[PDB]
Amino acid sequence: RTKIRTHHLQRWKADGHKWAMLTAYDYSTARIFDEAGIPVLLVGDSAANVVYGYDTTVPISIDELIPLVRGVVRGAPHALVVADLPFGSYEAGPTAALAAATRFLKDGGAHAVKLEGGERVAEQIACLTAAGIPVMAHIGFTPGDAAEQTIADAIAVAEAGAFAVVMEMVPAELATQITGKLTIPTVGIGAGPNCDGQVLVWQDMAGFSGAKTARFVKRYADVGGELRRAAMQYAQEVAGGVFPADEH
Amino acid sequence: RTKIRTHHLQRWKADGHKWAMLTAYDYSTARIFDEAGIPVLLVGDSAANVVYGYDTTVPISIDELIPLVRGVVRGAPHALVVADLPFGSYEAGPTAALAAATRFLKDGGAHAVKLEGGERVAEQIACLTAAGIPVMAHIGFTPGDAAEQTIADAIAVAEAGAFAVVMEMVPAELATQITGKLTIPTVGIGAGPNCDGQVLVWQDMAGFSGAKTARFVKRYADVGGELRRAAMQYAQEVAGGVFPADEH
Amino acid sequence: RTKIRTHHLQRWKADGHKWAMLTAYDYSTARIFDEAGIPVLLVGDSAANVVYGYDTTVPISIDELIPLVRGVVRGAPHALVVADLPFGSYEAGPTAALAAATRFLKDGGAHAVKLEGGERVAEQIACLTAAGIPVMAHIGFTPGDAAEQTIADAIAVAEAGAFAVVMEMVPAELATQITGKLTIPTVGIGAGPNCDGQVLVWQDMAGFSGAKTARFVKRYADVGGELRRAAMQYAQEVAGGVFPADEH
Amino acid sequence: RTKIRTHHLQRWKADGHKWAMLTAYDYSTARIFDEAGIPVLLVGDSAANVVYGYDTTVPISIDELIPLVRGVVRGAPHALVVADLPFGSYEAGPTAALAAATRFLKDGGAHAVKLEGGERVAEQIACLTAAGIPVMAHIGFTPGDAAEQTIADAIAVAEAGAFAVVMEMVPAELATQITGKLTIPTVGIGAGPNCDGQVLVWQDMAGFSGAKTARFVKRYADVGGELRRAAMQYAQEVAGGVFPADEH
Amino acid sequence: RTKIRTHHLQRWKADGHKWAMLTAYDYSTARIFDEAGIPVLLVGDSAANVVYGYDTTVPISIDELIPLVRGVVRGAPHALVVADLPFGSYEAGPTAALAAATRFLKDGGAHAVKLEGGERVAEQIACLTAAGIPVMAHIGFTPGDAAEQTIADAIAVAEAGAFAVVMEMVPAELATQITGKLTIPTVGIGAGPNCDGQVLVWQDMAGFSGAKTARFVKRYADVGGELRRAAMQYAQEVAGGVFPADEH
Amino acid sequence: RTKIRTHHLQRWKADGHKWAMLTAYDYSTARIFDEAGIPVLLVGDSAANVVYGYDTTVPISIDELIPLVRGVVRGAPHALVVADLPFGSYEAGPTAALAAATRFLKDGGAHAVKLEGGERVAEQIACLTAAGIPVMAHIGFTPGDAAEQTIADAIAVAEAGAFAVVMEMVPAELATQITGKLTIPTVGIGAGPNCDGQVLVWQDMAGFSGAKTARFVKRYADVGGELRRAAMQYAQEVAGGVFPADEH
Amino acid sequence: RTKIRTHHLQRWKADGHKWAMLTAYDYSTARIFDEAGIPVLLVGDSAANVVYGYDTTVPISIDELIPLVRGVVRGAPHALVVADLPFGSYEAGPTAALAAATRFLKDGGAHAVKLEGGERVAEQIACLTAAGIPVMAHIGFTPGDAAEQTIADAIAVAEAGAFAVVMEMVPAELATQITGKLTIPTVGIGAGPNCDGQVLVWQDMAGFSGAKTARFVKRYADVGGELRRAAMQYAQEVAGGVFPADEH
Amino acid sequence: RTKIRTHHLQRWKADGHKWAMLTAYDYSTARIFDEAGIPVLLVGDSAANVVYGYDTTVPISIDELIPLVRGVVRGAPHALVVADLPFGSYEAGPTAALAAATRFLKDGGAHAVKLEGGERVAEQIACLTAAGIPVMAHIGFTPGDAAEQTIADAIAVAEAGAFAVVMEMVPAELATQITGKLTIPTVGIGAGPNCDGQVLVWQDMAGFSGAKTARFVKRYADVGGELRRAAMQYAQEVAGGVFPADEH
Ligand SMILES: [Mg+2]
Numbered sequence A, B, C, D, E, F, G, H: 001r002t003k004i005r006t007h008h009l010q011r012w013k014a015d016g017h018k019w020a021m022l023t024a025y026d027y028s029t030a031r032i033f034d035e036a037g038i039p040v041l042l043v044g045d046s047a048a049n050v051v052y053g054y055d056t057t058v059p060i061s062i063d064e065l066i067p068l069v070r071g072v073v074r075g076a077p078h079a080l081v082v083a084d085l086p087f088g089s090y091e092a093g094p095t096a097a098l099a100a101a102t103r104f105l106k107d108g109g110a111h112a113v114k115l116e117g118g119e120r121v122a123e124q125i126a127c128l129t130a131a132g133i134p135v136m137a138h139i140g141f142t143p144g145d146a147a148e149q150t151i152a153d154a155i156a157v158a159e160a161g162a163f164a165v166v167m168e169m170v171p172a173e174l175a176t177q178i179t180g181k182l183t184i185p186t187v188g189i190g191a192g193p194n195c196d197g198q199v200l201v202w203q204d205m206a207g208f209s210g211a212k213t214a215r216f217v218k219r220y221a222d223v224g225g226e227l228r229r230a231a232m233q234y235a236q237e238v239a240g241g242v243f244p245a246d247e248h
């Protein structure tokens, strides 16, 4: 079928089609989401937690991501795969950011990268965008004047060239407006329902990590739990000599 | 509770306790299997397929594994985590193998490593074992005289110091004997029911990869499928403005 | 005979001589095109597809090109060999671009390099040109205001020093004008007939890749097919003991 | 359909099926030979001449080959791709040879490697073979006692583990015998008709390089010449304004 | 319980809560201070003396600190761990400073870094702060106009983004004012009692180094002396055969 | 006074003088033990736990030790400072071990190194010893035949050249004998009272880590606890404005 | 006694105390000058000649100096040791100069560095000075307008932060003035008697190199000659069997 | 005049000419000893003390020597310059030793190297000697059987190829014999008067280091003291305005 491209997300904002974005970190997962119809996959730095067990996204390195990106890229032939730039890889300036992004494309095989930041990151977004690298921006709300800054960021980020922007933990009201005020699609996560698209960490979306589903997350299943019995039953059958059988 | 150690596997062979080993490649998965009671986790090179999308286990590199090992090590505090040595990292001889294994322990944080091979690999197993590195052997059956070699390998491998050995695609009959003939535990996968323990790639065990469950694999669930709807439903709700709601 | 130099292309624009440029990626091919009279050879990044099987030109690296350039340079003693700068090697700025180009000349043995881009790349083109490195520009059309930009690019690029410019996927009408408006030769590919010169990927020109000849490509032969029988017949004769004979 | 594996070549020696091996050095060529049914492809060091223009095979480096191997591997999904080890990469001993071969498999994606040499190279062939790396041997005839050595080499090489052996410039008589005396398939090139299989440099097989077809080579076509007109005609049409037309 | 964050220090300045900061350089020490309730730990460059025996803080390198930081980070789960930047690692400018700080966070696991300097270092503090790296400033008094500069530094440093500032060897009077004039907390050491918080090198605080307690330091114990007998008694018991006993 | 040398330990075995060895990992600690009369200091890999918070001694690297050794060397001018070789740095063989040890002497400034292992490590001990590097051996007891091996190790190790040997977790009875059977001093830790000398991790010796003093350790003080109040009191006085006072 | 610091040189200019600076390049020499009371030692790049035999100061590298600096630093505990920056290590700009100087302090153990140059080097002097690195300037006279430039340099250099400045080959008259016009001490060598301090290459000062004592140098001895007999006599006694005697 | 070669030392042993060897570490010193007639110069690792202030010869590195060797080589055109191999550079075996020595010749410009050791070092001496590198051996006496070993070393060392051997701290009686028993010259230092030649550290020979002249050293002067006044007088004249005068 059709391979999602950035322009598709733009058309969808026009046609009013609200698309879904899911986070992915390996081949098998991506394969599933791809044959499930998910148009956009995010190899997020959130992998730091769900994949590597870091209690933050500060330690994860580019090298802990590129190999995962390659895997996701191979598993979702129809999805637009976005590679998230790790903390520290782009804050230095355009040159650094460009080198990092270039690695994600030439090596990781990603189609686009996600650069987190507000106005302070416009220069970087511009360089990449001008280099021909699709950039998905990521802005937030950090408490009044805060709402102003969020807006300034949303504007600056789009001006820089971002083909879309993620609004994380942004007051639904403010989000709604920004969404209507920007020409590019807005992807929300705890941003309210008024965003051109939505994004969730698949681990949360399918109950695969812990049990604490935050407010902005809707638990669409208990894939984690389902895996627990599968394992527990497997274990018992092994102990009970029931497995393997002869057909095995 | 109790952190599984190699001696436990030995005691279990004595008490006739058949234990289950599951493959794992990330923090979240390991966490689940750990709280599911799985005693031994294998960060297999099978990750080459299920994690990175390689159609073989030949290309995967040490660097594509170590970071995954670290994650698994963090997610399974009670399991005995075994790191699998990638193709090419130990065939050169003891020195190479030792360096590679040392990386998996000092860096990966693994408790033991899995070295695939027969007699030809005894020297390597001995060096590591003597260095204080727990080694899980891995022998197979490659078609008559074949059964002899498998036996020779099983013997040589144990002589070298392996604390356990994996029998993959080994005729149940031959396996049964070898199991009874060795002092160390035998972990099978398509080796028959007469092995001190069993091992499966969790992706297959829980139907997370493709649909072709081979003969030696028992599909204990459809975790993959379950994830497909979760994603599909999520997508539709996004399109239907049903998600996010206000509680989000 | 005569070794084509950049000034020749300029004279030809004056004399109204429409010259042909062919893509080349190895010694044997270049040798053929050279003794076939082709004046200009392009070791394009299109090699990413036809040579390495990448589905894009994003992954190909300088190192996957330089050795090919050297080969082409050795096979076409009379042609003006142009080396194409890979994605990511010049977007960072002049310094990067200069280093990359310098490698293609000092190492690759190329006579000139092709830098893809519009106004955004003028700075780079200027640095190289001033360094004494012949630069062939490459501009395109990306949909109204688009035609304006194409023009701006054509102008900026020439101002920067490009000895010629490639117009790819440019509306014949717009192309025609630009061609007449620029002092330097315009080389088209899907740009219409009104260009000082034409360029095609030899694989397409001679039907050596797939069967889908796009609109802008004219299939001058089925060299690929011809190779298929040669191989098939060879195979059968081998099977039929007809080859080798005794004269062999 | 079916992906050729080494055992297939063995079965064929049994069934008396004479198979054909063709040299290949890029994606497009491999694609053609693959859909032409060629079972085995050799990314030979002969590329030194036909690809890079070296007048010998002494200068070509591993790095000038690996990227070509990757391309060939991508173009022939059904063929058994063999990567030839460059001069100097294995003569030092097993350790060196193993490292080199490992690169060709893990990086190049090759299925097997070709190691040129006689008895003096048995140690290397053994190490690789034991490492799980399929090795295609390559022996020759260098003038009386010579025939003895060729035989000794044929024997030693097979003893070392080679799954097949290439006999180049070997007296048909001697070749015939060796072929009958070895358990593994013999692939000839100027070795006579009595070899389990045949191999030719595709450039010669299809008349793509020079015009001097040596005795052991049969010119199955003039693909090179066919390319010359295609180019010459293309050039003239460009000059004659006939190309591009409007359909372009 | 609660993990101290930078905002806590701000709240405390508001509530008038004077907090204590202690220097720490290893896991065991940090563990103690953590379970002793110390909110902020400083892996100081002072380690140069107390840890490595350098008579100055000029020679200590980043590598002699990062591993210590990791240890302290592991020992104080509830403390805000601040890593001090070594001499020479940030004076070159923002780029250098950013790279250094990034190492301390991504590798060292620190939560914040301490950058010593006045106005001259504002640019660096700004870059880090904007990058999302918490920076603790450090200003001093170097003899009239001196008091002016100290003030200028206090102002500039806070303007740059520092979440707090250390006043070392600053006239209590001047300190008092600066403390009242700044919005961010002031941490003193020989700065007088009018600072939002206090800091001491634990070695001095607990009499573990030398016997010369300077004026600004209050000796809260003789932990060093206590260790001397422990050692001396241990030694004598060993000599007296009293140790080990049988319970040992 | 007198700087302890290895021969001193030998004389002491003769005179029946039981000496005490203490572990040390920094300048200030070493200074204390030195002026406390401790003759031998061990910069152990036990630092992995007490210094860096690793739950094992497997991860610690040479680089996490050398800088500590330098510090200890500077703090104990009269002690014989022994540097412990980290896991993985000598198991490969003499060459590796020699390079590692050489670093500890030339860089770390150590006087001797400690190599853990039995017979399997004799070759390494011999190389270093012959190189002029004082080696302290380290053997253990790992459960019958075990006692035999311990003995074999004690013998082999001394034969190799070790100037002394550490017996850790060795049955007092067996230890007693070995001590009497060897010409070189035996240093015990959980080895019983019949050893030429004793060794303890200062953290345990002075109650600085946790509260679980194992059987073989005698808690000579609560230096850790003493540090807790010092810190707690310091904190309260800061909060109570009592500190700093004016004398400060 | 007292360790000379830069402020001492300033006080001395005030008290009118003319201090002497001597060049030094090794431990033994420095030890002598230190116990001889010399306050300032210069590890000059003049070492290029007297130490390494270069006929110029152009070839000497940082690495040929740092190890000498370390030696001098160890030999003169009371002197202010100044390390010279080698040709080419600071002319590129502040960044380069800062890195070089930082090596001399952190590695060499120097207290200050000497940067040769006039106005053109102010930027470098400023960066180092602001970094906390004491810089001794070095200006000269190169023939009218020359005297103006010397003055401009003297001014610029001091403005940049130099704690002192060397006037080499400067007309005594001009020197006298500059000395009176600057706030910082002036150290002369062939600059006349009106300088806050004097400096000479110890080799010349003590007649250790050649015999041609230039005008600005006063030969205070013939230490070189004295060494010649010592050697000659030693040689003869060896030949005469007089040495060694029995007391030897 | 004549440039001393190794054969000269041999002739001298024959003619009974007792030659003198002096240690040297810089250009100026070497120049003096050269024009003083000293035939052999030793760039000893004793430089560790006299040049760099190390209290041992354990820390000095090859890099702290090579540059000094180059200097000495330039200063003594007629002397046979011998470079010493630093601790750790040859104990690993021939390969290591050869590489190290090769650096001293090709880079340092030395004519020969000094390898310290007894029988244990014969292999190394043999490799170098066979490579064409003149090796000066160095054996000692370490207390009965000791005298036997010294002899064994003297024999082994000469057998290995040493063109001469240094006997340090060897009982004059034993020395006398060894001297008469060896075919190669013996150079003593505290070895008695019966050695083909003598060697002393010039610092001791001329009273340039400390005042404690050991038994085996004869103080031929007080060059150090002479330098002290030269410096002291220089200093006073500077202070007294007597220097510089006008002639300066
Ligand atoms: Mg992030």
Ligand SMILES: [Mg+2]
Residues within 6 Å of the ligand: B045, B057, B087, B116
């Ligand atoms: Mg495997």
Ligand SMILES: [Mg+2]
Residues within 6 Å of the ligand: C045, C057, C087, C116
């Ligand atoms: Mg391109």
Ligand SMILES: [Mg+2]
Residues within 6 Å of the ligand: D045, D057, D087, D116
């Ligand atoms: Mg060849």
Ligand SMILES: [Mg+2]
Residues within 6 Å of the ligand: E045, E057, E085, E087, E116
């Ligand atoms: Mg500091």
Ligand SMILES: [Mg+2]
Residues within 6 Å of the ligand: F045, F057, F087, F116
């Ligand atoms: Mg240990």
Ligand SMILES: [Mg+2]
Residues within 6 Å of the ligand: G045, G057, G086, G087, G116
């Ligand atoms: Mg200079």
Ligand SMILES: [Mg+2]
Residues within 6 Å of the ligand: H045, H057, H086, H087, H116
């Ligand atoms: Mg020595």
